[PDB]
Design an enzyme around this catalytic site. Structure first.
Site, mmCIF file in Angstrom:
data_model
loop_
_atom_site.group_PDB
_atom_site.id
_atom_site.type_symbol
_atom_site.label_atom_id
_atom_site.label_comp_id
_atom_site.label_asym_id
_atom_site.label_seq_id
_atom_site.Cartn_x
_atom_site.Cartn_y
_atom_site.Cartn_z
ATOM 1 N N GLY D 40 27.351 68.292 73.943
ATOM 2 C CA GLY D 40 27.251 68.005 75.379
ATOM 3 C C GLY D 40 28.374 67.072 75.826
ATOM 4 O O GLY D 40 28.901 66.321 75.015
ATOM 5 N N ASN D 108 22.984 67.806 64.262
ATOM 6 C CA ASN D 108 22.261 67.998 65.509
ATOM 7 C C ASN D 108 22.987 69.058 66.375
ATOM 8 O O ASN D 108 24.118 68.778 66.799
ATOM 9 C CB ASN D 108 22.305 66.597 66.176
ATOM 10 C CG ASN D 108 21.689 66.537 67.562
ATOM 11 O OD1 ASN D 108 20.856 67.369 67.932
ATOM 12 N ND2 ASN D 108 22.080 65.495 68.339
ATOM 13 N N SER D 177 10.721 58.684 80.560
ATOM 14 C CA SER D 177 10.827 57.232 80.532
ATOM 15 C C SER D 177 11.835 56.727 79.489
ATOM 16 O O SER D 177 12.063 55.520 79.343
ATOM 17 C CB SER D 177 9.433 56.618 80.304
ATOM 18 O OG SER D 177 9.057 56.646 78.933
ATOM 19 N N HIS D 262 15.723 67.918 72.682
ATOM 20 C CA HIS D 262 16.889 68.344 71.913
ATOM 21 C C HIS D 262 17.577 67.201 71.178
ATOM 22 O O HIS D 262 18.657 67.383 70.634
ATOM 23 C CB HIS D 262 17.850 69.016 72.887
ATOM 24 C CG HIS D 262 18.968 69.781 72.247
ATOM 25 N ND1 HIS D 262 18.787 70.662 71.200
ATOM 26 C CD2 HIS D 262 20.289 69.831 72.556
ATOM 27 C CE1 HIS D 262 19.949 71.204 70.881
ATOM 28 N NE2 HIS D 262 20.872 70.724 71.693
#
Ligand code: NA
Ligand code: NA
Ligand code: NA
Ligand code: NA
EC number: 3.7.1.8
Lengths: 283, 283, 283, 283
Positions: D40, D108, D177, D262
């Site tokens: 990302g 990841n 949160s 994720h």
């Protein structure tokens, strides 16, 4: 056939409903097939089914494209019970008013939930049951919930805009080249025309969240021959729910269209019409 | 139509095959549809498809129920390559011998593997592709493998007996009341009549295990319009493979029958015939 | 630790049970962990858990390997209610008799059903919940039912034989080299020793079929931290039920072992012990 | 440990890479564990793993949080091959430069793809393999693709804004949160600091789309003991890919966290650290 030439209104009276105005579009005069639309802002019977009404009428059916309570030209309403059930009472109210003994039901999404609830509550009043991506059937075994499309549906209800409408429709449909100005303008007009429906949908959803719509535990009661359709690419209701229905309803079959989102009867109209007409004739 | 009145033989010559005898049952004279049978002991074209041949011929098709190499009345063979591929070469050899330019293929289980391999190897020679629980598509995401039915198929090949045949058929079919003496006696006769086929199937499987049949990686090559059927209750090939095909073949649809094992075209003959004929006519 | 040195009996009294004899194997003296066995012929606490008792005791737990009613050395019984519930009442009866306020539960298959029912009926009496392929959770979305292993379990109950026992164990375990003479002889002895249990299991199952065990609709009530294990290769209970539990229980995790059948705590004892002890200590 | 105190640079030279600058964060001195981050905008080693580095170092490992090429403080790059492979060459280049013979890999998402490619290309250079929602493993059997999160990742790359970043993170994480100002500001800073990385990622993706990253067909080559983690609620990579890995890698296990998106190693840091450290020590 046009929306104008087929448009009708009927007042219904059925548990909770009193002199409640239901708009529907009717054509044909054979066995009745009631088609029930999805729950997105601006949804309605004609909008959802105008690619299906002609071929079904040609096949010899009387087609009723019903506007559910709190949608399109039907009366505004705030519901405190799960919408599938309330909608089903409205279908029964329509049928009683029109002297229809039994109907085949075709139900898309919210309309699929409506059709399932009708089958459960009024088993003597249904013929065959056709379901396209029905909503509310509890959690998915694979899809994070709320599903992508459902988040967009709630965003558009709360903050209606032409841009957010376009965003929703992009997720609603597999083939982006189906999103014409005609489609966008039509949906936007239906949204602009009845802001009260948007407000009331949200109030209703707070009173009875989607988690209260789940009728899974009662599926074994359904004796109607059932035809389930799913879009392979449906981002609003999860594909594994087609399997859920197939395992839990006594006499069901499942048809899954490739390259298809949440509006199968429109995205794959030709194959949908042929399959469902064949089902009604021969199953 | 009867097995005797439709029975024909043709010698084929195609990569590896030299003057190799293929038995088939033929009826009708329109566009050709070649139906391809499963891989269980005693399987054959007529046996597998006698509930389908009439309606397809009535619809205007020329139907060829082909016996694959090493089955029924076709020549005995020991294969050292995956059976789907070898079978597909045999289909091409048959088509060349009979001057058939293009055929629609209907393939059950091993026959589904055959049909997929044919579509891949000879894309210019296929029309539409119809698959019923095709085998060899690699691992399941859910089902322990070898699947229950496949273990029984290997048991029956290695130690043929009437009792083990009955055990297999009980797993093969959902509705146990379909297992008539006629069905049992017919399958047993085909097993007794050609013990060499049983021996050769096992030798072949050692040379090229089912793990070598997987054509998954090539599914994106298939340009044929494809109709996939699955039995919800199929204990031989896993339901999730229907999804595998639906996601990987460009233009596919998936139809799943409830209360249906591994012989969908026979267990749900009426609906199968209607759906597949509609597909061939209109898709 | 041995079966003999750990063996104990206690009479329980709890809804329906009156002076009912429960056999269990106990070792250790820390926080109580009650381990609950599967429902196959000849199953019992020590048999099912003898690879787990030592490491859990070493970690500081008091381990109770309980024989469920109608199994092993516990009293014979014919049940007319779903076994998970009846078994759970028996666990509560044991705990009351032994002055145990709260227990962690470890439940394999039928024992998983027992543990789920206990969590639902007696939420104030459970600590953590550990489930290994729990049974009765309704239909699978993928697996034809009854599952392969369950058909074998019923065959062995109705016609016990050493050969059918070996057939069951072959399906029960992934790695065939685990099926030693010791394993076979032990299970066969437990079957021979109490033929009444076999008869009574079958009578019970007619009174309350597995279709009545489904507690799915109540899973949202479970507040216990939950650890779910599945064998990837489990032919008795379907893998997708691990997902079902993961989506429906508030605080769960799912661990799936590769190359593992329906006896995960024995087939993958080292990893199981480490994971579950870690869970009890730190979760 | 802080980002500043652990920060290091090394130039690598490996097929295609010539004097290419790699930034990494290093702590500890035992067996090497290389942790590899997602793809990302604004992703980097420290950002992705700062909740994991301490506990792994405490357990006795040397931890290297590597910045992949075209991310964070590593050199900018435009790739014309699938990123998992190019990234893996960069890991090998780092290991050669630092005289590391074998490393355990933790990967990841994009980093999971990197780790899989490393295991395939350099089997003699890997210890254990840990994967958290690895990307690129072809189509899902259930999830429409591109997945919701991936569409957002591409939107943010093409039109970076603080609002679109917040939208992505809302989909990235289950628990809302967790989205603190610190998290938002940190990610936004990394995006603002290297606009070239954003541009280059998009150019790279046009040269080698995600459809070219699929290594599924080679999974049987992996001999590393493998631990697969998935977030139940992951909207970026589909849950069924955890099953895909479990069925296709020889020695794997699958752990699925509930209430988890994720970023499992951060969202469920305590349980992740315990499980993975246990795996490295004892598996
Ligand atoms: Na067009
Ligand atoms: Na009959
Ligand atoms: Na051994
Ligand atoms: Na907090």
């Amino acid at each position: 056939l046009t929306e104008s030439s087929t448009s009708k209104f009927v007042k219904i009276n059925e548990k909770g409903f009193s002199d409640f105005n239901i708009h529907y579009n009717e054509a044909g005069n054979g066995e009745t097939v009631i088609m029930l639309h999805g729950g997105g802002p601006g949804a309605g019977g004609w909008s959802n089914y105008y690619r299906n009404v002609g071929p079904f009428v040609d096949a010899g059916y009387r087609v009723i494209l019903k506007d559910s309570p709190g949608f399109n030209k039907s009366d505004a309403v705030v519901m405190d019970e799960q919408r599938g059930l309330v909608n089903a009472r409205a279908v029964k109210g329509l049928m009683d008013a029109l002297d229809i003994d039994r109907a085949h039901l075709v139900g898309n999404a919210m309309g699929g939930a409506t059709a399932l609830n009708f089958a459960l509550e009024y088993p003597d009043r249904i013929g065959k049951l056709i379901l396209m991506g029905p909503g509310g059937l509890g959690p998915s075994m694979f899809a994070p919930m709320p599903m992508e499309g459902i988040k967009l549906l709630f965003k558009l209800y709360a903050e209606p805009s032409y841009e957010t409408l376009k965003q929703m429709l992009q997720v609603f449909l597999y083939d982006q080249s189906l999103i014409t100005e005609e489609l966008l303008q039509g949906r936007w007009e239906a949204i602009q025309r009845q802001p009260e429906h948007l407000k009331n949908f949200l109030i209703s959803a707070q009173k009875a969240p989607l988690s209260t719509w789940d009728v899974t535990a009662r599926l074994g009661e359904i004796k109607a021959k059932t035809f389930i359709t799913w879009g392979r690419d449906d981002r609003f209701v999860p594909l594994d729910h087609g399997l859920k229905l197939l395992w839990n309803i006594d006499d069901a079959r499942l048809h899954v269209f490739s390259k298809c989102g949440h509006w199968a009867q429109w995205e794959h109209a030709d194959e949908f019409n042929r399959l469902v007409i064949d089902f009604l004739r021969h199953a």
